[PDB]
Design a protein around this ligand. Structure first.
Ligand SMILES: *CC(=O)N1CC2(CCN(C(=O)C3(Nc4ccc(Cl)cc4)CCOCC3)CC2)C1
Ligand SMILES: *CC(=O)N1CC2(CCN(C(=O)C3(Nc4ccc(Cl)cc4)CCOCC3)CC2)C1
Ligand SMILES: [Mg+2]
Ligand SMILES: [Mg+2]
Ligand SMILES: [Mg+2]
Ligand SMILES: [Mg+2]
Ligand SMILES: [Mg+2]
Ligand SMILES: [Mg+2]
Lengths: 236, 5, 236, 5
């Protein structure tokens, strides 16, 4: 790989620079190189990896939705035939999105998850696995769609099981996992009641544990609790 | 769209 | 080139889609393919070309400035040595920027400018030539820096000479050229007085011609006049 | 930075 000749520490340094420059594709490429060195990632390094790919795929998802909406409108009654170009370009964006997802899933499978023994690392990686299968599910229309959805569910569920055993209810990773799994239920699994129940129970159990926290931990936890509340407000 | 992290 | 098999009209259609999706790298690649078909560009097509590359290089310039500032800070007294990584990454971004500029300049030279006989097209392309040499000048530090600056000046000056002969003082292309040439004077040529004189004279001559315009032309002209005023306010 | 178009 093109980053094989660069020192691990230099890749991490450059990922941080790329983040400051809002160069998320470069950030992701640097972090992929760092992962491929084969050593486990620290907390900060796991966060860099996640931020980089979240921003790259986030932009691809936004573009895919714009193009999909145009394509859907083209297929309404009374819409003039404009040829294959909208489908082709939506497909191009879709294929690039799928590529990025497959790259992340590949890093997780070779070999981040299998080496992650602490709850904080293992839950984080399993949540990412769920997230990138969820993005694949958003664009899936074929024979494998159910298996893709189930892959996301399974990863999220394993993460949830560990998180509930090993982490306090205010832990930001536990909270972020629950946030995202709740969105999976609402948007992917056609399970809005499960989505709402998960968000509410997660919020409420977190609330009850805030008293244990420092000011700084309180700030971290309450930020994600507000995201849960924001989703609940959207859904109820 | 809903919030995710 | 990778767009050689795609119809001209399809490339233009996809450039418009890419713009809607804020996929400016794709937009630029589509427009490069369209130019390489060898036919002259309509007004709308010239605008697509310009928008695409302005947005790509704009993002590269912003990133280059972030990295350059970090690099400059690293070279201050009392700054800890952090190795070659900041310079390397600034160089990487710089090389990519230069590549994009060279691509645009190449399209202009082969063969957009030489086929452009109407003032509106020729001025527009010569302004772009000035703009992309200006971006090269922003990052130039070597033997050729003076020649790069002079290439920008020459292109802008030829555009100015045609614009003054052939276009009314409110014409948006004439106004945009003057805006950008004034910035060249201020930021590249170390000529703030020339920059201010050009912006003021351009504004004032435009003001005097607004009475000739429809409502819609008035809106177009006054928008760019306000940009001139904004720069004057910054500089005085 | 100054305005350009
Ligand atoms: C090292 C580690 O395990 N970390 C640092 C993180 C905890 C704090 N944090 C946040 O609170 C964010 N992002 C995320 C929270 C939770 C998860 Cl699972 C993923 C990201 C910061 C950005 O705004 C949202 C909250 C960063 C990550 C987990
Ligand atoms: C076809 C043609 O020659 N055009 C369309 C343009 C005139 C209107 N226009 C603007 O007013 C913009 N952009 C620019 C103005 C002038 C120049 Cl030289 C370049 C771009 C629209 C975006 O906000 C700024 C004013 C688009 C281009 C020239
Ligand atoms: Mg080493
Ligand atoms: Mg497909
Ligand atoms: Mg339950
Ligand atoms: Mg043809
Ligand atoms: Mg260089
Ligand atoms: Mg003069």
């Amino acid at each position: 790989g093109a980053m094989g000749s660069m020192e691990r520490a230099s890749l991490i340094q450059k990922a941080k620079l790329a983040e400051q420059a809002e160069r998320y594709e470069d950030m992701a490429a640097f972090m992929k190189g760092a992962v491929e060195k084969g050593e486990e990632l620290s907390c900060e390094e796991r966060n860099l990896l996640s931020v980089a790919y979240k921003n790259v795929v986030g932009g691809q998802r936004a573009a895919w939705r714009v193009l999909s909406s145009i394509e859907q409108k083209s297929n309404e009654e009374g819409s003039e035939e404009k040829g294959p170009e909208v489908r082709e370009y939506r497909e191009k964006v879709e294929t690039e999105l799928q590529g990025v997802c497959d790259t992340v899933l590949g890093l997780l499978d070779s070999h981040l998850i299998k080496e992650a023994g602490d709850a904080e690392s293992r839950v984080f990686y399993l949540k990412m696995k769920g997230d990138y299968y969820r993005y694949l599910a958003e664009v899936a229309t074929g024979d494998d769609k159910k298996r893709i959805i189930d892959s996301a569910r399974s990863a999220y569920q394993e993460a949830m099981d560990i998180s509930k055993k090993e982490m306090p209810p205010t832990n930001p990773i536990r909270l972020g996992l629950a946030l995202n799994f709740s969105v999976f239920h609402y948007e992917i699994a056609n399970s809005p009641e499960e989505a709402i129940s998960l968000a509410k129970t997660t919020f409420d159990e977190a609330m009850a544990d805030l008293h244990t926290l420092s000011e700084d931990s309180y700030k971290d936890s309450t930020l994600i609790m507000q995201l849960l509340r924001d989703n609940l407000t959207l859904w109820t | 769209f809903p919030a995710t992290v």
